[PDB]
């Protein structure tokens, strides 16, 4: 990066009185402050109740109980009957009438959840998976090679040229989406991901129109595969069946919309954060680059722990709960701070060390476990592995050259711009 930081440096002590999770100012602070704040919560107030971020002039919603300890987050995850994912998994849903439209299975509880997830899982047939794995390698290889051909100067923004496009190109390939439609899908996806960001001034009207357009695209794509079988995920989604239940084109479209967010910005930020850490801790980059295949599993897992691309997921209590002697009421919101669990001193030795050999690594960046456990976790690990493999092969000395431009977000640990250079 630019800022010298010794591997293993703990975050500053942040006094409890200085932590305001309900403050947009809090989420704009650097990671050192945020990590130190969650370190304080874990030690002094591991379960605590916060108001949601108020966007002045817009409805804010009711507050939430922050779970900051790995054990609590794991417990909440493994009890979806108490900690519901319906109505939604963000602190405050700005379009609650569209919660299932954008959320597909992630906003569902059982039995609806298990039915949808089972049928979707069935669609990942060996032939479809093999195509996905080939796509991961091909797209990573192509995007890194193109970075080189597009930048004779040896510098680029990792996010725009690689971390951003790779996950979405992979989702497009698995849905069987023609190369010519990539620009449209990219534009729609970026408007959706960009909505609400201070700098991307997209209005709600454009956001809705884009949201319906990409849904209509996906329904049309699904409908085409009902007549024209192909070896893509879309066809296997239309053909998959569990206990006689099949997916409508509308349900497939909502799952696609989930993927272009949940399968996309997450992996993007894992990659960018992994690049930043491998840049800040060059001994870890040397270790991995010296034994790439042998260390890939622990290196990737450590990148996910380190990045925690999903900062939190929200649950809603169906029943009163008591735990760490803290009474939480039925109907209360609960938030699972993976960013905090992934630094929990009770679970990880040397939590502040980015260690590509880390083992064990019970990181919950894909969630605490249980029913909603990241459907694409293995795909994400593969994308991470392969993209760093292609960087190792084509530009082994690539390094971040500047601190990243951070996404202002409570939900996504986002990097907007990560300058890199290579020789």
Ligand X SMILES: CC(=O)OC/C=C(\C)CC/C=C(\C)CCC=C(C)C
Rounded to whole angstroms, how far apart are CA atoms 337 and 325?
19
Using CB under 6 A, which of the segments 37-45, 48-56, 225-233, 370-378 binds ligand HEM? 370-378
The first and second tokens of residue 212, run together, are 């319906």
Q: How far is the CA of 256 from the CAs of 4, 101, 249, 351, in angstroms?
A: 41, 10, 10, 35
Residue 28 CB, nearest approach to ligand NH4 (Å)? 9
Residue 369 CB, nearest approach to ligand HEM (Å)? 7
Q: Select 53 or 89, whichever has its Cβ closest to ligand HEM.
A: 89
Residue 180 falls in which region: left (phi positive, over 0), alpha (psi -120 to 50) or beta: alpha
Burial of 198 (0-12, 13-18, 19+ CB in 10 A): exposed
**Is 70 among the annotated ligand-binding positions?**
no
274 is a site residue for ligand HEM (CB under 6 A): no
In the list 52, 215, 365, 404, the residue contacting ligand HEM (rule: CB under 6 A) is 365
311 is a site residue for ligand X (CB under 6 A): no
CA dihedral sign of residues 260, 263, 266, 267? negative
Residue 408 falls in which region: left (phi positive, over 0), alpha (psi -120 to 50) or beta: beta
Residue 360 falls in which region: left (phi positive, over 0), alpha (psi -120 to 50) or beta: beta
The first and second tokens of residue 156, run together, are 């680029």
**Is 372 among the annotated ligand-binding positions?**
yes
In the list 195, 256, 312, 366, the residue contacting ligand X (rule: CB under 6 A) is 195
240 is a site residue for ligand HEM (CB under 6 A): no
Q: Which residue in 91, 101, 105 sits closest to 50, CA to CA?
A: 91
**Is 315 among the annotated ligand-binding positions?**
yes
Which option in ligand X, ligand NH4, ligand HEM, none does residue 270 bind, with CB closer than 5 to 8 A by kind?
A: ligand HEM
Residue 238 · residue 232 · CB < 8 Å: no
In the list 46, 165, 351, 367, the residue contacting ligand HEM (rule: CB under 6 A) is 367
262 is a site residue for ligand HEM (CB under 6 A): yes
* Three-state DSSP class for residue 369: coil
169 is a site residue for ligand X (CB under 6 A): no
**Is 117 among the annotated ligand-binding positions?**
yes
In the list 41, 53, 106, 275, the residue contacting ligand HEM (rule: CB under 6 A) is 106
Residue 361 · residue 305 · CB < 8 Å: yes
270 is a site residue for ligand HEM (CB under 6 A): yes
The first and second tokens of residue 112, run together, are 């609806």
In the list 86, 249, 266, 267, the residue contacting ligand X (rule: CB under 6 A) is 266
Residue 19 CB, nearest approach to ligand NH4 (Å)? 13
Calculate helix-pair angle for 126-150, 165-174, nearest 10 degrees.
Answer: 140
Rounded to whole angstroms, how far apart are CA atoms 31 and 46?
19
Residues that bind ligand NH4 (CB under 6 A): 23-25
Residue 48 CB, nearest approach to ligand NH4 (Å)? 18
Residue 82 CB, nearest approach to ligand NH4 (Å)? 32
* Three-state DSSP class for residue 120: helix
In the list 34, 84, 117, 358, the residue contacting ligand HEM (rule: CB under 6 A) is 117
Residue 310 CB, nearest approach to ligand X (Å)? 5
Site for ligand HEM, rule CB under 6 A:
77, 105-106, 117, 258-259, 262-263, 266-267, 270, 304, 309-310, 313, 365-368, 372-376, 379-380
Binding site for ligand X (CB under 6 A): 88, 90, 93-95, 102-103, 106, 192, 195-196, 261-262, 265-266, 310
Residue numbers belonging to the annotated binding site for heme b: 113, 117, 315, 372, 374
């Amino acid at each position: 990066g630019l800022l010298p930081r010794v591997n293993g440096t703990p975050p500053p002590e942040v006094p409890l009185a200085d932590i305001e999770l309900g403050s947009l100012e809090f989420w704009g602070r650097d990671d050192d402050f945020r990590d130190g704040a969650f370190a304080t919560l874990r030690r002094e107030a591991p379960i605590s109740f916060w108001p949601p971020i108020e966007l002045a002039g817009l409805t804010a919603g009711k507050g939430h109980w922050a779970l900051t300890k790995h054990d609590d987050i794991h417990f909440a995850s493994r009890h979806p009957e108490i900690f519901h994912s319906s109505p939604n998994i963000v602190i405050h849903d700005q379009t609650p009438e569209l919660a299932e439209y954008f959320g597909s299975m992630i906003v569902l509880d059982d039995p609806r959840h298990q039915r949808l997830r089972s049928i979707v899982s069935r669609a990942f047939t060996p032939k479809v998976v093999a195509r996905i794995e080939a796509s991961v390698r091909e797209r990573a290889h192509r995007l890194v090679a193109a970075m080189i051909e597009n930048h004779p100067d040896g510098q680029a923004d990792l996010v725009s040229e690689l971390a951003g496009p790779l996950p979405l190109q992979i989702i497009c390939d698995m849905m069987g989406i023609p190369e010519e439609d990539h620009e449209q899908i990219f534009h729609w996806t970026n408007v959706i991901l960009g909505f609400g960001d201070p700098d991307l001034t997209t209005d709600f009207d454009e956001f809705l129109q884009v949201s319906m357009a990409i849904g209509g695209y996906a329904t049309a794509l699904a409908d085409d595969r009902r007549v024209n079988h192909h070896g893509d995920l879309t066809t296997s989604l239309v053909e998959a069946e569990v206990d006689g239940e099949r997916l409508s084109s509308s349900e497939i479209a909502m799952f696609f919309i989930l993927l272009v967010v949940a399968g996309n910005e997450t992996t993007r930020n894992a990659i960018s954060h992994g690049m930043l850490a491998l840049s800040r801790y060059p001994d870890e980059r040397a270790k991995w680059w010296s034994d790439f295949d042998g260390l890939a599993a622990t290196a990737v897992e450590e990148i996910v722990r380190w990045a925690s691309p999903v900062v939190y997921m929200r649950r809603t209590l169906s029943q009163d709960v008591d735990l760490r002697g803290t009474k939480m009421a039925a109907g209360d919101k609960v938030t699972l701070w993976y960013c905090s669990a992934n630094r929990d001193e009770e679970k990880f030795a040397d939590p502040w060390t980015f260690d590509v050999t880390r083992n064990p690594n019970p990181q919950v960046g894909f969630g605490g476990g249980g029913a909603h456990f990241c459907l694409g976790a293995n795909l994400a690990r593969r994308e991470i592995r392969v993209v760093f493999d292609e960087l190792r092969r084509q530009m082994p000395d690539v390094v971040a050259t500047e601190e990243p431009a951070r996404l202002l977000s409570q939900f996504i640990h986002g990097i907007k711009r990560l300058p890199v250079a290579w020789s």
